[PDB]
């Protein structure tokens, strides 16, 4: 009953694989993981992917200790600039001598479509990793016990 849920790369891959393997579900974009969800919360390190001849779509990468996913960043059409939250990442990456860092990213995912990335903030404290893991486990248990 909650559209937002925190989960990692491995769960994203497992959910997509399960949805694709058995497509006998309702005719709606919503996924099915102990309910219907649209948004996701994940903390993982971010790195740009240099695609070819893809101006409107910018491909990113979110690798983690469990796996990896592919995300797409959209940009404005009336003019050719980047979103502020990713411009900050670009300038910080330039400043710190091209060192990749973990980010706290919120991403919207729908079936039969790519995974949009909406917003992230650079994290500098390693305590966020334990916080994210504990939050993931707690929310998974809450969802399972609320289904029953």
């Amino acid at each position: 009953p909650q559209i937002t849920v925190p989960l990692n790369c491995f769960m994203i891959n497992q959910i997509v694989k399960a949805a694709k393997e058995n497509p006998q579900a309702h005719s709606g974009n919503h996924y099915e993981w102990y309910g219907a969800f649209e948004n996701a919360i994940i903390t993982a390190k971010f790195e740009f992917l240099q695609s070819i001849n893809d101006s409107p779509k910018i491909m990113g990468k979110l690798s983690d200790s469990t796996g990896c996913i592919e995300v797409v960043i959209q940009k404005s059409k009336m003019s050719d600039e980047l979103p502020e939250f990713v411009q900050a990442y670009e300038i910080e990456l330039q400043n710190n001598g091209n060192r990749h860092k973990y980010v706290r990213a919120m991403l919207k995912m729908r079936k039969n479509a790519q995974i949009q990335l909406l917003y992230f903030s650079i994290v500098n404290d390693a305590n966020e990793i334990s916080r994210h893991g504990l939050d993931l486990c707690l929310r998974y248990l809450q969802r399972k016990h609320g289904i029953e």
Binding site: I3, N29, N39, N53, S55, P56, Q74, K77, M78, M106, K108, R110, N112, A113, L118
Partner: protein, 1012 residues
Amino acid sequence: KQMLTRKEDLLTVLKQISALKYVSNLYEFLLATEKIVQTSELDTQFQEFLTTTIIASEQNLVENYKQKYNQPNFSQLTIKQVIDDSIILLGNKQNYVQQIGTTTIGFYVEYENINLSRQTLYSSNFRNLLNIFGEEDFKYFLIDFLVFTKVEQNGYLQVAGVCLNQYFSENQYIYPEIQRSQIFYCNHMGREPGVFKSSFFNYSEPQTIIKKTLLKEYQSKNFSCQEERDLFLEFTEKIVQNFHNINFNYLLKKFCKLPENYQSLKSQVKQIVQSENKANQQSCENLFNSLYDTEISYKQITNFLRQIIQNCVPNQLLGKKNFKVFLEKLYEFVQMKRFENQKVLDYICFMDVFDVEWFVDLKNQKFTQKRKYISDKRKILGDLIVFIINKIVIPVLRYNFYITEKHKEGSQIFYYRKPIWKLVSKLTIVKLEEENLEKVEEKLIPEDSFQKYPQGKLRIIPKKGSFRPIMTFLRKDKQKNIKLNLNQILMDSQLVFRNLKDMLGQKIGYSVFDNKQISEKFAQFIEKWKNKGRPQLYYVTLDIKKCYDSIDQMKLLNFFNQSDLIQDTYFINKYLLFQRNKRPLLQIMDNINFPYYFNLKERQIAYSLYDDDDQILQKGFKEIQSDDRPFIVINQDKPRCITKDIIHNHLKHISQYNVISFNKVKFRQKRGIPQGLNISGVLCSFYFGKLEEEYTQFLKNAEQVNGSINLLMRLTDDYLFISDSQQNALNLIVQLQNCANNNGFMFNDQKITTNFQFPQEDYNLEHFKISVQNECQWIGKSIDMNTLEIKSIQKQTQQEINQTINVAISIKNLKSQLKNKLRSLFLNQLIDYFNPNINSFEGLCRQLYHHSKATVMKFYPFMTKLFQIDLKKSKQYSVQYGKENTNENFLKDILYYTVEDVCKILCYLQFEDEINSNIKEIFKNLYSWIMWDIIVSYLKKKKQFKGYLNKLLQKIRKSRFFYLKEGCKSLQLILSQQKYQLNKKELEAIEFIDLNNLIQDIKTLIPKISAK
């Protein structure tokens, strides 16, 4: 030249606005961006939707939306998801049509209010449009463009983009305002003449007390130093001390005293009050008339006020000459009308700052910067002037007199001594108790209605031989958690009744409410009369006496309950309406915006949940248009509900438990509904329509049984009947009398005005006083029985015209105010009865002649008031009209442009778009010459205008005559080219032009139009 057209398109109008650089329909934009091609095939309804939809943008963005070969267009998202993505893309911006009724929470959008425009956005046509566009372009198309979708023949509905109402949008000192409105309608009386006991004159009986009571004026920021405050405090101390030595009894006896027979009037009033039996009508009329002739003249009160001010205020507080100026302006203050007021600058601009001697400047600005010193001391002089009038003059007038206006005197102001008004109030209360008002006690009324509704007040307006009570429901009770007055409580039921009002027009009676309905009825009757062959006509006019007080509450509730025209449940919608004005389109200085062409109005409507034909649920509005010009509507997100049970409870309360107050005494109505409530007008019409359809069956089938034309209309309590048969008129009189006898009401003054004469003894009509007149007069309109043409009635003297005009002029916006005032004065009533279907060419010319003669007299006081200000001292006007003759140039400019606009509107009203342009030009020149001749003739005698301005006006009039003659001369050659074929109306216009010989002069036509 530019002319008003009855037919226009939205695309043409939008191209005239400089802000929008790109205007086109959706189809041509789709082809321009290569989204679709002409070889592609589409549904006919989708094609129609693409053709009719109109879009616009502030810049050209065709290149940005060009089709890209990188990736095709396939849609997998729903329309809701795309719209949500667009709204999230909007972000913090707060004024967009798609944003109405919703809020954004991060990356989530919440729908919370009813928006009736969402049905268009979430329709199948927009789904197909999304399929054509694609998500990445649809999300930005909804933002960068203004989308108008056609829902009616001429109406459009904006569903996307910035709202249209957003286009319709270092400080300077502002002087205080004289509180002249306080003087009116004071009922309180005291034992000793003077001021109220709460005034600072009576509270004092040192400097401490006066400082405490006058804190608002002692600690003003306009005082430079503490020395000025001390001097002002000493002056106020002297003022207070002097006031207690004024013998008010002697002053009232000397200037404005009671009649010599006051004791006789008091004794008569006391005897009438004490007598148990009903008082005589003639004696009471004589007593009321004698009481009303004790009014005090303006000169008497001006002398009284001057005497009070001279011996109460020191001569050196304002200056030797400023005091005299103030005293002279006091008279002009006294004689102003009801809605007229003075300004502080009317005193300041005629005073000398340096006359005041006790003013002290902390810094020597008297010689270095004289202008700053003058400004600073003017700021104090204005405060002093406001203090004198508001504290002394206004309370004395409010305490010692009752100031009000009469019934047929318009806005003229009358003063009555307080004991006289106490006698009048006693007599009026005696008269009210016998018929419709009874004293009440709060024990009877239940606490629910006591704590739910606020109460009203009673006011008395003098009439010749009687009174006219008015009940006002403005108050709201601070206690019992009431924040609205009774009308605001009954606002929604008024919307429901207004919905009921439309069906009353034709279904269940003969009721009319506005001029358009009356004009349509007259046009239909005139067409039938012309078809019949113009036979003789007979008319009867009669009216109901006290219609509001003659209503039976039980019958009204029974009619309300058993009527099927009022539904159980209603929903309320709010929307904004943009409608074309009467301004022609300029043909392409650079700043042209929407307000130049459109008028913005806020509207509300009540609709039912049934599957009605009007289908308001799909659109959200219901507008009636008299032309083909476009209009735009945008919906709002504030819905409400109202049930028939709530209206029934409101009606039951107002009928049964109406309570009003008068001099701290409560009363209650015994019969009828109160006038002064927003729902009484429709209820009266409904109630009387029921009876009149009960007793007028013979009229329904008479149009076919014996073939006789007849028309019956009733506006409120006034009846008008025009027929072809005298027997029909007699039968109508008899039937209406029977209905009045059976239903307990009666006709005013037992008078009836007809066109014929009949023996009244046969029909038991002996008590009626039949008056025979050959020319019908109804609701201020004069109707001829031979040619059947209608024109309004105008007053004949300047004094009668002046009584209904209030003059308010501000220097900031002289031009706009004066031009709009002239426009309203010409277009007030002439715009509704200038129909070519009612009057002929000569009739229209005569109507214009008389109306313009009235309007010039109406506007004359504004021109005299303008000359009291010299514009050579204002840069804003002197830079444009020079310094030598600024006022004359300003007035000439205003008059010329107003007359031109009025002539254009008249030509738009008279002719159709199919008529040849030369005829329209000739008639416009004729109307302009008529109005300019009237203006020049009226103004040629005045002394203020005698010199420079009349020459310019005469030149304008001569130029109009020459242009009219030239157009008439060239029309013959233009028509002789045979390139044009003339229809019936054009031939009629040519016949009118040639018969009056407009080629040479006007002396043939003047006798026919000037006849009175």
